[PDB]
């Protein structure tokens, strides 16, 4: 059934999964026309395919020319998205073929599940968490890419960077949500956080900087007070 | 117009026929129906005082052999049989009408409601259906389950309806994920009618036949493939208009038929809602959409 609280562990067995992130696949600007209606101005997109036990990251660039001509975009997203999980499976090896995917939408169930028919053994899951993965586009080198592309485009990224050489997929899991929860309450802080000492450097190869143990620390400290200070800023407390 | 006798009445039972139904004592004097219409199917169905739990009873059309009613102390149920000797069932009846001893199907001469609920159904796609080959007539009751309810145990005593299944290969055709199930035309037209049911006819007669079942044994595999027939039709958004329109008929004579007390467990709200006001064809059954609000408004 549903991803939970409950059956958290499961993210980190040794039975191959996907997450599934769809926010990202439709992105407009809303502005107004010379008329003064409103009109929308798609930009490129992308699709967030995560493997949370390895850190490995298919991010399917979205190019705005797959929206020409079309009607309800957003519903078409949601197929888009399907349609290209499903290319992506197609293209693994057996082995490398995930059991589960976890779609971080309910939306994302039936294109999904009808998308895969000819996969009746890879089980197709919701979650009952809210997962911030919509940060993803805060994390400079996948926007950069994102917004850079041309055309129809694949990148692969390891969003833990090295951090399995030191920690546990679960602990390398916990890091990560964390920081996009963080970037995603408030970005320019969390970046902020992430960039202060510029002793710190981001490696070519990396998304984030190379902390130390005792550095991870101190920045996980950071970023969880910045996720307590706008709950109360927003909520007053 | 025709006759099914019965030989005695030997446990107290509420019997059916087409949508009247009259008591019957233990041990009254009770030795059948008469008067039956010829020219459509019917059903004899049975309720027993004791346990209302299991109504059964029997698809049968009289144009296709002379059948009675047996009571079986062993099996404990009324029991359909054919009488392979005319002339001793022709004396049986005639002696049992000179004693008065019949009920008479109690049709008003206005009344098409019995025609207009099985229009399209016929006693050899029953027997398609409800597979039992050595007998003419087709016994149905609220436990049997469907074939594609096996799949999700008994094959002999199954229901083979047609299987429907919108996340199906069969229902989506490869490149056409989203076209095919947002618009299930292809699969009502191509698939379904084209391929297996071969014209509109034989579908309406399923569906029919699924509702009647739903409705007289309270068969819930049954209920569940009518508003599967309606769905796949009101999700097309190129039908036939001759099946629009005949479809309007069935389902205004099916809702008004239907006991308003059991409206609650016999109609699915998620489907009438989508058909009637969400999907393609919710502007083309005026005549369902007006019976269907003026009698269970709650329901939508
Ligand atoms: N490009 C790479 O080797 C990544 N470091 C690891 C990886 C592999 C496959 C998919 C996503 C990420």
Known sequence: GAMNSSNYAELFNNDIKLFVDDTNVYRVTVHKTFEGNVATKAINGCIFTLNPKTGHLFLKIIHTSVWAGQKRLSQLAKWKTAEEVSALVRSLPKEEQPKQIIVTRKAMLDPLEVHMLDFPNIAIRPTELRLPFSAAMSIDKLSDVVMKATEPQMVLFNIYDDWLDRISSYTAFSRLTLLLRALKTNEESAKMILLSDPTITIKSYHLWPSFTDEQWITIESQMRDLILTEYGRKYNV | ?300
Not at chain 2, 181 to 200: A, C, E, H, P, R
Not at chain 2, 226 to 233: D, V
């Open chain 2, 1 to 300: 117009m025709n006759t099914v006798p019965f030989t005695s009445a030997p446990i107290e039972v509420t019997i059916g026929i087409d949508q009247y139904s009259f008591n019957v004592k233990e041990n009254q004097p009770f030795h059948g129906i008469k008067d039956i219409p010829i020219g459509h199917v019917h059903v004899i169905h049975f309720q027993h005082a004791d346990n209302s739990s299991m109504r059964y009873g029997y698809w049968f059309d009289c144009r296709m052999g002379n059948f009675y009613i047996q009571y079986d102390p062993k099996d404990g149920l009324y029991k359909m049989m054919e009488e392979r000797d005319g002339a001793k069932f022709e004396n049986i009846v005639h002696n049992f009408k000179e004693r008065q001893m019949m009920v008479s199907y109690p049709k008003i001469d206005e009344d098409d409601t019995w025609y207009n609920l099985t229009e399209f159904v016929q006693m050899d796609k029953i027997r398609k259906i409800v597979r039992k080959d050595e007998n003419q007539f087709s016994y149905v009751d609220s436990s049997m389950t469907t074939v594609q309810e096996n799949e999700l145990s008994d094959p002999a005593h199954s229901l083979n309806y047609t299987v429907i299944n919108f996340k199906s290969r069969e229902a989506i055709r490869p490149g056409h994920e989203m076209e095919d199930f947002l618009d299930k035309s292809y699969y009502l037209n191509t698939v379904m009618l084209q391929g297996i049911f071969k014209n509109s006819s034989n579908y309406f007669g399923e569906l029919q036949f699924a509702f009647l079942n739903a409705m007289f044994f309270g068969n819930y595999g049954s209920s569940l493939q009518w508003h599967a027939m309606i769905e796949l039709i009101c999700s097309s958004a190129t039908v036939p208009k001759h099946m629009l329109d005949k479809l309007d008929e069935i389902l205004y004579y099916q809702i008004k038929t239907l006991p308003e007390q059991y409206s609650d467990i016999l109609l699915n709200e998620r489907v009438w809602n989508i058909c009637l006001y969400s999907s393609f064809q919710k502007n083309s059954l005026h005549n369902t959409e007006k019976i269907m609000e003026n009698k269970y408004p709650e329901l939508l």
